[PDB]
Amino acid sequence: LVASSGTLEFITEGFTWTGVTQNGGSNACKRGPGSGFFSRLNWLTKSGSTYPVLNVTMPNNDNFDKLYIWGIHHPSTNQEQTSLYVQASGRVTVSTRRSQQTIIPNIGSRPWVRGLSSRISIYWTIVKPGDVLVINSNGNLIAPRGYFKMRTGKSSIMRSDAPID
Amino acid sequence: VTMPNNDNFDKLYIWGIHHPSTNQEQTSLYVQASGRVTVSTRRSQQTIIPNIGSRPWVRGLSSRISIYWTIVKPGDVLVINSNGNLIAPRGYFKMRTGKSSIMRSDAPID
Amino acid sequence: HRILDGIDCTLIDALLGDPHCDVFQNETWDLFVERSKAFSNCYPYDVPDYASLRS
Ligand SMILES: *[C@@H]1O[C@H](CO)[C@@H](O[C@@H]2O[C@H](CO)[C@@H](O[C@@H]3O[C@H](CO)[C@@H](O)[C@H](O)[C@@H]3O)[C@H](O)[C@H]2NC(C)=O)[C@H](O)[C@H]1NC(C)=O
Ligand SMILES: *[C@@H]1O[C@H](CO)[C@@H](O[C@@H]2O[C@H](CO)[C@@H](O[C@@H]3O[C@H](CO)[C@@H](O)[C@H](O)[C@@H]3O)[C@H](O)[C@H]2NC(C)=O)[C@H](O)[C@H]1NC(C)=O
Ligand SMILES: *[C@@H]1O[C@H](CO)[C@@H](O[C@@H]2O[C@H](CO)[C@@H](O)[C@H](O)[C@H]2NC(C)=O)[C@H](O)[C@H]1NC(C)=O
Known part of the structure; x- marks a missing residue:
C-alpha cells in the first residue's frame, strides 16, 4: 500500500x-555519532519515576486519507520492561470511530540482532477525512511523530538488480 | 454454560465481548480485574481477551463491543466459559445454503 | 428473484438486532440490497472479519 x-x-x-521521556x-540505531531511532518514530519512556495512562487524540480535518505508522516494544526481560515503562506489562490501543486494535507487549528473549534481543512490532492505522485517531497506553508505545500522505496512484515497488539507464 | 446442537442442521451463534474505557467501569460492571471469554465447540476454539482503553466518543460511549460467531454442527456441542466481559447470545440462526447474496446499491425497486 | 430492501439498515446490523432494524427479524431474501443511506444506531461495535460475517 x-x-x-x-x-x-x-x-x-x-x-x-x-x-x-x-x-x-x-x-x-546509530545516527551519526551517538544513539538514535527511526526518524518517524518517537520512543516514549518513563518520566523520572512514573509512566501514566497516555491518552492523546488527533482529529483529521483535511480532505484526504492519513496513514499513521506506530509501534510497540517487546522487551527481553521483566526488568527491562519495568526499567523503562514501569508497569508489569504495557498495552497500546489505536482507534478510529470505526476500527480498533490492541497489541500487548510480550516480555522475552529473541536472537541477538545488532546487540539487542528485544524488538519492535510495527503496525498501521489509517484515519479517513473527518475521523479521529486516539492513541492510548499504559506502557510500551513506540509512538507516531505525525502522518504520511496517501495518494491513489498507478505506482508500484519491483525488486531487481538491473542497472538504470 | 453449554447447549447441544441435536437437530440435523448447522446452528450459527453471534456473540461478543465488551472492552471498557477504564478500570473504574470494569470493576463496576464485571467485578474482576481482567475478564476473558472462551467459546468452544469440540472441534474448534477461540479465546478473546478485552482491552481496557479509551476510544472515540460515539453516541455517548468511548467503550466498545467486539463481535464473534461460532458455528456448531450437528452432534458437536457449544460451550461458553467466562469470568467477566461477556456478551452472550440468546440462541442461534438457521443456516441455510443457497443462491442468496447481498448487493450494494442505491437504485429503486420496481 | 426475491428482493429485500434494507433501507437504513446494514444486513449485519439487522442480524445483530439494532433497534431500528427489528423490522427485519426472521426475514428471508434471495438478494439483500444494502442502501448507502443506511446507518447504525446502538452500542458501538466492531466485528473482526466483518467482511466474512456479511458474506
Ligand atoms: C537466552 O539464550 C540466548 C542464546 O542461548 C542468549 O543469547 C546470547 O546471549 C549472549 C549474551 O548477550 C550473546 O553473547 C554475545 O555474542 C556476541 C555475538 O558474536 C559477542 O560478540 C558478544 O560479546 C556477546 O558475548 C549471544 O550472542 C547470544 N546468542 C544468541 C544466539 O542470541 C540470551 O541472552 C539468553 N537470555 C537470557 C535471559 O539469558
Ligand atoms: C481520553 O482522551 C479523549 C480525547 O483526548 C477523550 O475523548 C473525549 O471525551 C469527551 C467526554 O468527556 C468528549 O466530549 C464530548 O464532545 C462532544 C463533541 O461535540 C459533545 O457532543 C459532548 O457534549 C461532550 O462534551 C469528546 O468528544 C471526546 N473526544 C474524543 C475524540 O473522543 C476521553 O474521554 C479521554 N479519557 C480519559 C480517561 O481521559
Ligand atoms: C515533507 O513535505 C512537507 C509538505 O510538502 C514539507 O513542508 C512542510 O512540512 C512540515 C512538516 O514537517 C510543515 O511545516 C508543513 O505541513 C509543510 N508545509 C506546507 C505549506 O505544506 C517538508 O519538506 C517535508 N517534511 C519533512 C519533515 O521532511
Missing part, C-alpha cells in the same frame, strides 16, 4: 506526550 501510494510525504504533528534512541 505504500508502494502504490507512490509517496513518502510526511507531515509532522505535535502530539501531547505528557509525563514521559520522549526521543529514546539506541546503540543499534
Whole structure:
C-alpha cells in the first residue's frame, strides 16, 4: 500500500506526550555519532519515576486519507520492561470511530540482532477525512511523530538488480 | 454454560465481548480485574481477551463491543466459559445454503 | 428473484438486532440490497472479519 501510494510525504504533528521521556534512541540505531531511532518514530519512556495512562487524540480535518505508522516494544526481560515503562506489562490501543486494535507487549528473549534481543512490532492505522485517531497506553508505545500522505496512484515497488539507464 | 446442537442442521451463534474505557467501569460492571471469554465447540476454539482503553466518543460511549460467531454442527456441542466481559447470545440462526447474496446499491425497486 | 430492501439498515446490523432494524427479524431474501443511506444506531461495535460475517 505504500508502494502504490507512490509517496513518502510526511507531515509532522505535535502530539501531547505528557509525563514521559520522549526521543529514546539506541546503540543499534546509530545516527551519526551517538544513539538514535527511526526518524518517524518517537520512543516514549518513563518520566523520572512514573509512566501514566497516555491518552492523546488527533482529529483529521483535511480532505484526504492519513496513514499513521506506530509501534510497540517487546522487551527481553521483566526488568527491562519495568526499567523503562514501569508497569508489569504495557498495552497500546489505536482507534478510529470505526476500527480498533490492541497489541500487548510480550516480555522475552529473541536472537541477538545488532546487540539487542528485544524488538519492535510495527503496525498501521489509517484515519479517513473527518475521523479521529486516539492513541492510548499504559506502557510500551513506540509512538507516531505525525502522518504520511496517501495518494491513489498507478505506482508500484519491483525488486531487481538491473542497472538504470 | 453449554447447549447441544441435536437437530440435523448447522446452528450459527453471534456473540461478543465488551472492552471498557477504564478500570473504574470494569470493576463496576464485571467485578474482576481482567475478564476473558472462551467459546468452544469440540472441534474448534477461540479465546478473546478485552482491552481496557479509551476510544472515540460515539453516541455517548468511548467503550466498545467486539463481535464473534461460532458455528456448531450437528452432534458437536457449544460451550461458553467466562469470568467477566461477556456478551452472550440468546440462541442461534438457521443456516441455510443457497443462491442468496447481498448487493450494494442505491437504485429503486420496481 | 426475491428482493429485500434494507433501507437504513446494514444486513449485519439487522442480524445483530439494532433497534431500528427489528423490522427485519426472521426475514428471508434471495438478494439483500444494502442502501448507502443506511446507518447504525446502538452500542458501538466492531466485528473482526466483518467482511466474512456479511458474506
Ligand atoms: C537466552 O539464550 C540466548 C542464546 O542461548 C542468549 O543469547 C546470547 O546471549 C549472549 C549474551 O548477550 C550473546 O553473547 C554475545 O555474542 C556476541 C555475538 O558474536 C559477542 O560478540 C558478544 O560479546 C556477546 O558475548 C549471544 O550472542 C547470544 N546468542 C544468541 C544466539 O542470541 C540470551 O541472552 C539468553 N537470555 C537470557 C535471559 O539469558
Ligand atoms: C481520553 O482522551 C479523549 C480525547 O483526548 C477523550 O475523548 C473525549 O471525551 C469527551 C467526554 O468527556 C468528549 O466530549 C464530548 O464532545 C462532544 C463533541 O461535540 C459533545 O457532543 C459532548 O457534549 C461532550 O462534551 C469528546 O468528544 C471526546 N473526544 C474524543 C475524540 O473522543 C476521553 O474521554 C479521554 N479519557 C480519559 C480517561 O481521559
Ligand atoms: C515533507 O513535505 C512537507 C509538505 O510538502 C514539507 O513542508 C512542510 O512540512 C512540515 C512538516 O514537517 C510543515 O511545516 C508543513 O505541513 C509543510 N508545509 C506546507 C505549506 O505544506 C517538508 O519538506 C517535508 N517534511 C519533512 C519533515 O521532511
